[PDB]
């Protein structure tokens, strides 16, 4: 029943600089276990739907790295022990995302990133022609 | 290959910043020497070895301060004590075979 | 297709930029890596775009020495 009344105090100063428009934002998460990435996709999709982003999710093909090492510590080169590192992929595309909405979505996504995965963002910012090109100069 | 193509090849090289005048195959290595980072300055090379001096010294001081207890160093000291008791220790300087 | 290139200027730009232009999709891709920072590369990348356009309109004197084997059509 007893709660801290009005414990919210953030400020959002709306300046005069025009916002940056991103044509399309691509997020590619890579990890070792599918289950973590499967849950992470659900978290990203659920948050994206609530913000109204209309995202699409696809799974790029995986790649497997293998290498071979000797077994014993002396001679015996006919017996090998192999190892394998598996990197599973998952891509989340974002379309028609403004700069202001991009900042909050990415930082909210990045802070909740699990320890066993990492991600790369490819932002396709769009803008008009340069002043020299736009303004007629021969 | 015509004179028109030579100008276009040079004009494109001027804008993008490559070498304009013709250059020998062996003479292009000097560009490669400065374009890339030298092998001796890469972080993988000069920082290859962890500083064992700090790692060993730090745990040495913490062992004497009672904050870190090392089993392995205790094993050496305990066995070293037994050798002294048995009468077989390390002689001082100038005591090996000169006597 | 969204620029103000002339018939002569567009042909020179394709012959100047080289393989960075795709003949099917009519898209020009400029990739810059020399500048240490992304802001310097962005300023350098836009610098290449504007200097490649102001140069495609300079019909220099030697340009008339065209060979019949160098014509694209």
């Amino acid at each position: 029943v007893d709660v801290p009344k009005d414990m919210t105090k953030p400020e959002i100063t709306i300046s005069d600089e025009p916002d940056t428009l991103y044509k399309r934002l691509s997020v590619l998460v890579k990890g070792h276990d599918k289950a973590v990435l499967d849950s992470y996709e659900y978290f990203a999709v659920l948050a994206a739907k609530e913000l109204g982003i209309s995202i699409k999710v696809h799974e790029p093909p995986r790649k497997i790295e293998r290498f071979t090492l000797l077994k014993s510590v002396h001679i015996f080169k006919k017996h090998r022990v192999q190892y394998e590192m598996r990197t599973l992929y998952r891509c989340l595309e974002l379309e028609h995302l403004t700069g202001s909405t991009a900042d909050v979505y990415l930082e909210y996504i990045q802070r909740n990133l699990p320890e066993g995965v990492a991600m790369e963002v490819t932002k396709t910012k769009l803008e008009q022609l340069p002043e020299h090109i736009r303004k007629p100069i021969w | 290959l015509s004179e028109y193509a030579v100008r276009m090849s040079r004009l494109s090289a001027r804008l993008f910043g490559e070498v304009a005048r013709p250059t020998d195959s062996k003479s292009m290595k000097v560009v490669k020497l400065f374009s890339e980072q030298p092998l001796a300055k890469r972080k993988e090379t000069y920082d290859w070895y962890p500083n064992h001096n700090t790692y060993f010294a730090l745990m040495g001081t913490l062992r004497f301060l009672g904050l870190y207890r090392d089993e392995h160093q205790d094993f050496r000291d305990e066995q070293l004590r037994l050798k002294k008791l048995r009468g077989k220790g390390k002689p001082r300087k100038g005591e090996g075979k000169r006597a | 297709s969204s620029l103000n290139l002339d018939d002569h200027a567009k042909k020179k730009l394709i012959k100047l930029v080289g393989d960075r232009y795709c003949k099917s999709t009519d898209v020009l891709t400029i990739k810059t890596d020399r500048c240490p920072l992304k802001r310097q590369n962005y300023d350098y990348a836009v610098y290449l775009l504007t200097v490649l356009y102001h140069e495609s309109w300079k019909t220099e004197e030697w340009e008339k020495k065209k060979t019949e084997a160098d014509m694209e059509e």
Binding site: P130, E131, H132 | R10, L11 | V46
Partner: peptide, 23 residues
């Protein structure tokens, strides 16, 4: 034998000093 190092080439870096500074 041949010799022609002074190729008839013309290009001025200072011509594009303007776009170099600002858009």
């Amino acid at each position: 034998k041949k010799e022609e190092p002074e190729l008839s080439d013309d290009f001025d870096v200072e011509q594009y000093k303007r776009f170099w500074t600002k858009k």
